Structures are given as structure tokens and as C-alpha cells.
Paper text:
RAF kinases are essential effectors of RAS, but how RAS binding initiates the conformational changes needed for autoinhibited RAF monomers to form active dimers has remained unclear. In quiescent cells, members of the RAF kinase family localize to the cytosol as inactive monomers, maintained in an autoinhibited state through intramolecular interactions between the RAF regulatory and catalytic domains and by the binding of a 14-3-3 dimer to two phosphorylation-dependent serine sites (pS365 and pS729 in BRAF). In response to signaling events and RAS activation, RAF interacts directly with GTP-bound RAS at the plasma membrane, which ultimately disrupts the autoinhibited state and promotes RAF dimerization and kinase activation.
Analysis of the gel filtration fractions obtained from serum-depleted cells indicated a well-defined peak of monomeric BRAF that was comprised of two distinct physiological complexes, a larger complex containing 14-3-3 proteins and MEK (fraction 18) and a smaller complex containing 14-3-3 proteins but lacking MEK (fraction 19). Only one of the autoinhibited complexes included MEK, but both contained a bound 14-3-3 dimer, and in both structures, the kinase domain was in a canonical inactive configuration and lacked ATP. Except for the presence or absence of MEK, the overall conformation of the monomeric BRAF structures aligned well, with a Cα RMSD of 0.95 Å for the corresponding BRAF:14-3-32 portions and a Cα RMSD of 0.99 Å for the BRAF KDs. In these structures, the BRAF monomer exhibits an autoinhibited conformation with a 14-3-3 dimer bound to the canonical pS365 and pS729 sites and the CRD making stabilizing contacts with the C-lobe of the kinase domain and with both protomers of the 14-3-3 dimer. These results are consistent with the previously determined BRAF:14-3-32:MEK1S218A,S222A structure; however, they show that BRAF can exist in the autoinhibited state in the absence of MEK. In contrast, the RBD is well-defined in our autoinhibited BRAF:14-3-32:MEK and BRAF:14-3-32 structures, revealing the position and orientation of this critical domain. In our autoinhibited BRAF complexes, the RAS-binding surface of the RBD faces away from the CRD and is oriented towards a space that we term the “RAS pocket”. The position and orientation of the RBD in the context of the autoinhibited BRAF complexes indicates that the RBD is accessible for RAS binding, with key basic residues involved in RAS contact exposed. Nonetheless, both the purified BRAF:14-3-32:MEK and BRAF:14-3-32 complexes were fully competent to bind GTP-bound KRAS in fluorescence polarization assays and displayed high-affinity binding.
Author numbering:
A (entry chain A): 156 to 201, 204 to 227, 235 to 272, 360 to 370, 449 to 738
B (entry chain B): 2 to 69, 72 to 133, 137 to 230
C (entry chain C): 2 to 69, 73 to 230
Write the structure that this text describes.
């Protein structure tokens, strides 16, 4: 007999006679949870020689099997805007599927493209009414107070002045001043003469982490997509000017009374990795849930290279479609660092909610992929959501009767 | 001309122009030849998209219909009526076709199940758009006749059987409000296949697992 | 009424079926009032997808027509069956863009887009004809952009999406239809770079459409240079 280390935190004793190969013996047990000999992979200890499916198991008695997971092509003509999913260009015709949701490429003459359809701040002391500090976080301390109203000031950790560092902030505050947006919080100003209590707008409303674990109230999943879209759009604009968040958490995110999400309390890669001279070499901070595998490694000289924020978004998708944080079973800060950066551990995706579209479950297969070379930039991630944000009344039924492959390889 | 009706339907298959397969194949079923597996399949692929895409068109119009002066509602309500009548006429086209020449000349045991499966299937779309009791009970009786023929002739590891099991099961949950009947139907059909997975063919392996996958994906979904 | 036609258009847009809206919007063009921007792109999208549906229909059947003798005739006859449908609908909207909305207008940029459509749809008809049957259309299309394109480089800033929209469409007009990449390459780089120096003010006029077309220029050029 042989073991199996199933995803979804399960394990089932299974038999293994002679002659029968890998495929059927496991498939008789693999299928009970929705697998197939061509969507999974297992490895043996030697240190992981790939044990496929054709191979004979006559020499695999008393063994351990971690079954770690690795379509039918209807046609359509994408009326609304919709991007490809093999090169992430703009796609007009092409294949699809009723369940997966994944487009496919069509030239692998090569027709051209067309136009897609459509639809300074000086602040002196005197108005600074600073109150109790909220708490620590990603890059330091925050202070709820009052400046021209209920506006959240924010005092950094390393407030040690450097006359050239203020110029660096002038480089990082001027860029991060005029970028207004529907979602992003309207930044106000900076405390100049007193120590830097950044004047970032404060309002009412509950946070996302506050909304899911302190009270832990969920709604109808129609609103769930609303959260995964506006935060894909609000943070899309930040990457439109290359302004990475660098601290995307389920904490700073706000909700404007079930109307629209609001993102903020971000930026300032100068105070982070403070000037020890003329250098700003970076460091890890806060927690490593939102932060990315190639930021864990400490060897990313520019960690937020337009993709480390994509992984931060995904760790918000997982908090959206599971109601629980990642790694509620491993609760040690120092050790999870070792097992996430080197690639030994990735969030267990086979525990996600059951009543969510397969397309977004495919979105997390890329928006949470450990590599930074195949993350879909927020341009593509933004567009994908409206595709299945208006496609709610289309696949809401029970997995009925699908057609055949309709495509030949 | 029947083969001339073939090329004009397979070509229309990959054109997003399916109303040309409604015309072509409906004119093949009303000839009097033998419905081979290929043209049998194209009939299912043609109408399903023609009625399913129009069915799914109704659902989106339905969601906005319930999301509310009455001027906005009456316009959405009117469009709901317009697609509704098109749905019945594009489904009764199949329903009348089913009476005329399809079933009474069924040649094979597995074949008649395929049509008998479709009978109830096309009633289901008509049933859920609806005056009401007469349509829904006929569907079930059409399904029940498919049920009767299925268990005693249809193999337990065949896509049609599973698809009929799938459809008949999802019929219970959505229209007949009997999930316990559905999950029992799904589990029973699914389990026997798991015992029979050791014996199949590559020509039946592909579509079979997809239905079971959805059927198992259906199994997990209704558990809660 | 008028808003009932407009409202029905939006509802038809909802359900993946724009043929119903196109016949409803084609009535909107035949009203006689001043078309406005919000439903103006509804005019653009309506026939674009309706034609695109037939374009996708023609583009695939053309492939199997060349991928082949009675069977070839079946493809040959059907291909012309949809080209007439493709041409008739294009002629239906070409009548729209000629005798209906070009005369009544008072804002240059509003005239720019419709003139872009005139060059667009004439170009669309130019994709199906051959030899002599297209010269009267291609020349008509070229003037529609040239009239608008001169208004583009003069009367509107490079940030506005339509000028880039007029740029990307007009450039490909040279490569595929007119087979003149050199004027396309020069215009593409010019339109993109003259629009890359003034990207400071975006949110006041949706940044979305800009970067898509802006990106759609470089990657197109990446193909246009290889
Ligand atoms: Zn592609």
C-alpha cells in the first residue's frame, strides 16, 4: 500500500497491486476530489525525481505521494474589452471555456491591431492637533489626530533629519501629491517644522482586516467581486505612474459604507531603508503575508519592480475568497520566512471557497504565482475582473451540461 | 443535398453564426435518413448554443429586472418578453421536431436515450422560463422516460448517462427543489464510474471525466 | 420617444446581443437631433461588433476557403453569402455616417470621431472588395482621416484618447489596406511621442483609454518593424 498527501489538508490510505501503473491506481482515488492524471504531478525522494503517470509502480511499495497540482475550446468574439492570456496582448477572437474562463492564442498572416471600444504644500505648526497613535504596521507608526479636520497624521520611525533627505522626500512627495483617484485617499500635506506627521486624509468606515476577523461578517458574493475590482483599479492607477504601494495590507484598506473601497497609507521608499549616507538599501518589515517571495529573499535590489505589488494583491484575493488568512496552521513569523522565500511553501489554494468562479481561482493561479516573470500587471488584472463582474448572471447555475472540445490538436 | 447541408453546418459551426445550423440541420432531421453520430452531435451543439446563448441573455436581463417610476422596469420587462418568445419559438422548433421525425425512427438503444435526454433538456429551459405545471411535469415525464431507459440500457460510465444523470439531477435542485434526490443521483452515478474507471477507452475518456468533474464539482457545491 | 430608444440600447448592450441594439441605434442616427458623446461610442461599438461578428465570420471562412471540387464551391458560395451581408450592413452605416450626422455638428473633436468612422467603415468595405471595386472606397476613406487627421494635429491636444484612437486606426490603415508602412511608422512614432511628453494630465480625461492605445502603438510597431 502507498500513502497520499492530498491538498485541502487531507490524506487517504490507498492500495497498490502489481502490474497496474501510476494512472489508474491513483485516479480511482484522485477523482473523488476533482483531479485527473493530466492536471497533477507527484515526485519521489531520491531530491524530487519526477514520477509521472505511465511508469509502473511494481517498484514503489511502501511509498509517500505528495499529489501537488500542476480544457474544451469553444469560440467567441469578445464584444467588451478582453485581453489574451498567453502573451497578455489585446484579444478579439479566439477560444475560451465555459468553466475555466481562460482565453488562448490563435496564431501559434498575423493580423494587426486597432482601437478598442471605450465607455508647494508647506505646513507650519499651529493647526497640528495630534491625538492617540493607532499602532505599528508596515513601515512604522501612525497617529490619529486633527489637521484641518479629522485627518490622520503619521510619524515615521527614523525621523532623524538629513538636509539632502528632505530633497529626497521632495522627490517622493511631489510625485505622490497630485495623483488623485476615486479609490486612493486624497493626500493633504506633510508636517514640516515638527517631526514628520504626514497629513493623510482620515475618514470613517471599517478596514478589510477589521471587517473579516475582528467582526468577521461576510455578504453576498456579488459584493466580493466589487472589492476585488476597485482595489484592482485603484491600485492600477498607482502603477500607471509607477508609484508602488509597497505596503498593501488588508488593514489600511477602507470601505466607504458599502459604496466603494479606498486604498491609502502607502509609499515613501525613502524613510523605508533610511539614508545611511546616499544609499537606501532596503529591508523587510511588518509581516510577510502580503509581501512577496522575491522580496523575502533579500536579494531584490528593487523589490517593488511592478510585480511584487501583484503578489500583494493576490494575498488580498485569498483573504477575500477564503475568509481566513494564509497559513493559519503555521504560526511562527521567523520560520515561515525561510519556507516561503526559497519556494518550499506556497499558500494552499485547494481550500478556497466552493461557490466562486473557476476564472478567479485561475486568477489566483497567476496573481499569486511565486515568480515575478509571469505576474499579470494590473492592466490585465483590471480588465479580467469586469469580464466576470458583468458575467455573474451567466455562470451562476449548477455545473450543467457542457459541450465537447470543438478544437483539434 | 444532405451532405450539402453538412458542409453548410460544420462551416457555420466555427463562425459564431449558429442560426445557419438551426436552418441546415433542422432540414436534415426532416428528410428521413439515418442520423449518424456526427450529425446527431451537431444537432445538440447547434441548438444548445442557439437556445443557451439566448437563455443566458435572458438571465442578465432578469438580474437587472429585479434590481429596481415604472418606466425603467417596463422597458426591461418588455425586453424580457421579447427574448422569452424567441426562446420558446427556438425551443418549440426543437420540441415539434422531436415529435415529427426524430424519436419514432430511433435506430439504436443508446441513440434514443440521447434524443430522450434532449427531450427533457429542452423542456427544462421552457419549464424554467414559465401554463406552468403542464410544462414542468412533461419535462420530468420526458426525463423519467429517459430515467427508465437509462438505468436498464445506458452504461454507468458513459457521457450521455452522466450527462443525463447530471441534467436530471440539476433538474431536481433548480426546478423540483430536491437536492437530496440530486446528490443521491450524482453520488450513485459517480461511484459506479470510479469502480469502472479501470475499463474505458481513449475515445470515451475525454468527455467522461469532464462530466464527472462537473458532476463531482456539482457534488461538492451542493454539500453545504 | 427618444430616450426610450437610448434606454433600450443600453439594455440590449447588457445581454451580449447588439444586433437588436444596432437596429435600435440605427434608428437613433435617423432621428435628426445632435448626437452626444456617451451614446456616440455606443454607435461606435454597435456596428463595430455587428460588423466584427461578420468580420470574424468572414475571416474564418476565408481561411478554410484557401485551406482546400464541389466542397470548395460550398465555401466559395457561402463566403460571398456573408460578404454581401458584410457589405450591406457596412453600406447601411456608411449611409448613416454620410447623410445624417456629419452636416449637423459644432465641435471639432466631435467631427473628428465621426470622420474617423467614415474612414473606418469605408476601410471596412475596402477589406472585402478587390482591384477596381475598392478604389472609389479607399480614396473616400483616406480623405475621411486626412480631413480629420489635419484637425487632429491642429485642434486637439495629444492626450485626448480619440486623437490616439484616430492615430492607431489611421496608422494600420496604411499598413494593411494601403500597404504603406513608412507613412504608418512615421505617423505612429510621431503620434505616440508627441503624446508621451504631455502625459502629466491624465485623470481629467480618463487615463485608461490612453495607455491601452499608447501600448497598442509600441507593440504594433514591434510587429511593424520586424
Ligand atoms: Zn494570444
Amino acid at each position: 500500500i502507498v500513502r497520499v498527501f492530498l491538498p485541502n489538508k487531507q490524506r487517504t490510505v490507498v492500495p497498490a497491486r502489481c502490474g497496474v501503473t501510476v494512472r489508474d491506481s491513483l485516479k480511482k482515488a484522485l477523482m473523488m476530489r476533482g483531479l485527473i492524471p493530466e492536471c497533477c504531478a507527484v515526485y519521489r525522494i531520491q531530491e524530487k525525481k519526477p514520477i509521472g503517470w505511465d511508469t509502473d509502480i511494481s517498484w514503489l511499495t511502501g511509498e509517500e505521494l505528495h499529489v501537488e497540482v500542476l480544457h474544451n475550446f469553444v469560440r467567441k468574439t469578445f464584444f467588451t474589452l478582453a485581453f489574451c492570456d498567453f502573451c497578455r496582448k489585446l484579444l478579439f477572437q479566439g477560444f475560451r471555456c465555459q468553466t475555466c474562463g481562460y482565453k488562448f492564442h490563435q496564431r501559434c498572416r498575423d493580423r494587426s491591431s486597432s482601437a478598442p471600444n471605450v465607455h508647494d504644500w508647506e505646513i507650519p505648526d499651529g493647526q497640528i492637533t495630534v491625538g492617540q497613535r493607532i499602532g505599528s504596521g508596515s513601515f512604522g507608526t501612525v497617529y490619529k489626530g486633527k489637521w484641518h479636520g479629522d485627518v490622520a497624521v503619521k510619524m515615521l520611525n527614523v525621523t532623524a533629519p538629513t538636509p539632502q533627505q528632505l530633497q529626497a522626500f521632495k522627490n517622493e512627495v511631489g510625485v505622490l501629491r497630485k495623483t488623485r483617484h476615486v479609490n486612493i485617499l486624497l493626500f493633504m500635506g506633510y508636517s514640516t517644522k515638527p517631526q514628520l506627521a504626514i497629513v493623510t486624509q482620515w475618514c470613517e468606515g471599517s478596514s478589510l482586516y477589521h471587517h473579516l476577523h475582528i467582526i468577521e461578517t461576510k455578504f453576498e458574493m456579488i459584493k466580493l467581486i466589487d472589492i476585488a475590482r476597485q482595489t484592482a483599479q485603484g491600485m492600477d492607477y498607482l502603477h500607471a505612474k509607477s508609484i508602488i504601494h509597497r505596503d498593501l495590507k488588508s488593514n489600511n484598506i477602507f470601505l466607504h459604507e458599502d459604496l466603494t473601497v479606498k486604498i491609502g497609507d502607502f509609499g515613501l521608499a525613502t524613510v523605508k531603508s533610511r539614508w545611511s549616507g546616499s544609499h537606501q538599501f532596503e529591508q523587510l518589515s511588518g509581516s510577510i503575508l502580503w509581501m512577496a517571495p522575491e522580496v523575502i529573499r533579500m536579494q531584490d535590489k528593487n523589490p517593488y519592480s511592478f510585480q511584487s505589488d501583484v503578489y500583494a494583491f493576490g494575498i488580498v484575493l485569498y483573504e477575500l475568497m477564503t475568509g481566513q488568512l494564509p497559513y493559519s496552521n503555521i504560526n511562527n513569523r521567523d520560520q515561515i520566512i525561510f519556507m516561503v522565500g526559497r519556494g518550499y511553501l506556497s499558500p494552499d489554494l485547494s481550500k478556497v471557497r466552493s461557490n466562486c468562479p473557476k476564472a478567479m481561482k485561475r486568477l489566483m493561479a497567476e496573481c499569486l504565482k511565486k515568480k515575478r516573470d509571469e505576474r499579470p500587471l494590473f492592466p490585465q488584472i483590471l480588465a479580467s475582473i469586469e469580464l466576470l463582474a458583468r458575467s455573474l448572471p451567466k455562470i451562476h447555475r449548477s455545473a450543467s451540461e457542457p459541450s465537447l472540445n470543438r478544437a483539434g490538436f | 443535398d444532405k451532405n450539402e447541408l453538412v458542409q453548410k453546418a460544420k462551416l457555420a459551426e466555427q463562425a459564431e453564426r449558429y442560426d445557419d445550423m438551426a436552418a441546415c440541420m433542422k432540414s436534415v432531421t426532416e428528410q428521413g435518413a439515418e442520423l449518424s453520430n456526427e450529425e446527431r452531435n451537431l444537432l445538440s451543439v447547434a441548438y444548445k448554443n442557439v437556445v443557451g446563448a439566448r437563455r443566458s441573455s435572458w438571465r442578465v436581463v432578469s438580474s437587472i429586472e429585479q434590481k429596481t417610476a415604472e418606466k425603467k422596469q417596463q422597458m426591461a420587462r418588455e425586453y424580457r418578453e421579447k427574448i422569452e418568445t424567441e426562446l420558446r419559438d427556438i425551443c418549440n422548433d426543437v420540441l415539434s421536431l422531436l415529435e415529427k421525425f426524430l424519436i419514432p425512427n430511433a435506430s439504436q438503444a443508446e441513440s434514443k436515450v440521447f434524443y430522450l435526454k434532449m427531450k427533457g433538456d429542452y423542456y427544462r429551459y421552457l419549464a424554467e422560463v414559465a401554463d406552468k405545471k403542464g410544462i414542468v411535469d412533461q419535462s420530468q415525464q420526458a426525463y423519467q422516460e429517459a430515467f427508465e431507459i437509462s438505468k436498464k440500457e445506458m452504461q454507468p460510465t458513459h457521457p450521455i448517462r452522466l450527462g443525463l444523470a447530471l441534467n436530471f439531477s440539476v433538474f431536481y435542485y433548480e426546478i423540483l427543489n430536491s437536492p437530496e434526490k440530486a446528490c443521491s443521483l450524482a453520488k450513485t452515478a459517480f461511484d459506479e464510474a470510479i469502480a469502472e474507471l479501470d475499463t474505458l477507452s481513449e475515445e470515451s475518456y475525454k468527455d467522461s471525466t469532464l462530466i464527472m468533474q462537473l458532476l463531482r464539482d456539482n457534488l461538492t457545491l451542493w454539500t453545504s
